[PDB]
């Protein structure tokens, strides 16, 4: 389709430069500091999780038709008795692991759905707590450069 | 089995939350 | 600034999932496979460059008034006697190094300018060669790992 | 200065191309 080649090249440029800037430490915007601190905290959460247990989502049997119900049950229980930044990192790590299992077991259709379920839960049920506890700036203060 | 998973996530999240302060 | 409007919670989710999937080696789209292949080629190229030579970032003097002429001079000579994928990787790594040096020396305004220079050179002068040589999917065949 | 850099980019580019 008209213009698709040009647009894709622009996205490669943007993606390459953002990768290199964040790779060397430079956070050039606000959500850039949040993303970088979230990626780092997710890697640390996964490292601590694997040292104590088996890897995430092993023993979780996901299929496309049942995945939503499992996601909904895990996330509701994770935040049942409260929210804190550590549990929010767990929420992200869980979704990441769900997507990895999905691609690994050849259910790639689930990836963009899991992203929608996470964003919905994030906006509906975590953003009010986030706003009342300093916003994403506070998260960056607590987990950035880690 | 999904019961056990969210408990592992919650306790690991809380350990993280503590050590971040 | 680079990444002007990727500020939503939805994009934070998409960004984290994308980081986890590519960290474990999985691509959710053809475009994702190109981006991953290009980031890793850049990492590998710059490592080989730093061992044979100085830092790619131990650079010539960048200023806002001379950055384009430096860029144009280097790029035109890079492709004067022909194009191949290795030189296209070198072209991305060079732009990335200009951006890093620009931010490091407090000329952040140049990042978006360099991004335009790269997209413009790519779309006007490399895109014909890319199409005659199997497109970016052939790059992934040759430089992807998985 | 820039003649030197682009020579290093080109020869590193070509070696990487040959190896892939
Ligand atoms: Cl957005
Ligand atoms: Cl990514
Ligand atoms: Cl993508």
């Amino acid at each position: 389709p008209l213009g698709s080649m040009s647009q894709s090249n622009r996205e490669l440029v943007v993606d390459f430069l953002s990768y290199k800037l964040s790779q060397k430490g430079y956070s050039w915007s606000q959500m850039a500091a949040v993303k970088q601190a979230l990626r780092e905290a997710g890697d640390e959460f996964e490292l601590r999780y694997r040292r104590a247990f088996s890897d995430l989502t092993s023993q979780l049997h996901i299929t496309p038709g049942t995945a939503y119900q499992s996601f909904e049950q895990v996330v509701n229980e994770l935040f049942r008795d409260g929210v804190n930044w550590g549990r929010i990192v767990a929420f992200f790590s869980f979704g990441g692991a769900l997507c990895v299992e999905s691609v690994d077991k050849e259910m790639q259709v689930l990836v963009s759905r899991i992203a929608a379920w996470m964003a919905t839960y994030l906006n509906d049920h975590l953003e009010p707590w986030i706003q009342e506890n300093g916003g994403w700036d506070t998260f960056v203060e607590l987990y950035g450069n880690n | 089995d999904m019961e056990n998973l969210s408990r592992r996530l919650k306790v690991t999240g809380d350990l993280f939350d503590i050590m971040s302060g």
Side-chain angles (χ1 to χ4, degrees), chain A residues 1-26 28-35 37-45 47 49 51-57 62-72 74-140 142-146, chain B residues 4-21:
Chain A
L2 183 60
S4 63
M5 295 305 316
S6 295
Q7 167 67 26
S8 290
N9 282 335
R10 290 187 288 267
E11 291 179 24
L12 295 184
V13 172
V14 171
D15 184 85
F16 190 87
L17 302 179
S18 297
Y19 175 74
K20 283 287 141 180
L21 284 176
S22 78
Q23 183 185 64
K24 295 294 187 287
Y26 303 84
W28 56 101
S29 36
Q30 186 208 324
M31 239 53 186
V34 178
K35 291 178 192 186
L38 187 43
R39 299 178 182 125
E40 268 145 26
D43 287 336
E44 264 293 312
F45 179 97
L47 183 61
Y49 190 99
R51 284 205 299 261
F53 320 119
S54 76
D55 293 354
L56 263 173
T57 215
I62 50 173
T63 72
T66 69
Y68 178 67
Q69 294 69 37
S70 317
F71 173 99
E72 178 180 39
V74 171
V75 176
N76 287 342
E77 178 56 35
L78 173 64
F79 291 111
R80 219 227 330 139
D81 49 19
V83 180
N84 64 48
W85 289 111
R87 291 181 184 194
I88 290 174
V89 179
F91 162 83
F92 277 95
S93 285
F94 169 55
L98 225 36
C99 288
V100 161
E101 183 83 314
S102 290
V103 184
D104 184 52
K105 290 164 163 56
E106 302 166 36
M107 304 174 304
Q108 188 158 93
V109 77
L110 281 180
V111 173
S112 69
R113 301 180 191 176
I114 294 174
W117 307 336
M118 293 174 67
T120 295
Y121 193 92
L122 180 53
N123 284 307
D124 286 358
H125 302 283
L126 291 177
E127 179 78 355
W129 181 93
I130 296 174
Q131 285 307 106
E132 241 169 305
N133 283 96
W136 287 100
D137 295 346
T138 290
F139 175 80
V140 174
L142 293 182
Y143 294 77
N145 311 320
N146 269 14
Chain B
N4 168 273
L5 170 54
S6 41
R7 182 166 199 237
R8 292 169 150 182
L9 297 172
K10 184 187 296 196
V11 180
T12 301
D14 288 345
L15 181 60
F16 231 68
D17 187 54
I18 297 179
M19 304 188 67
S20 84

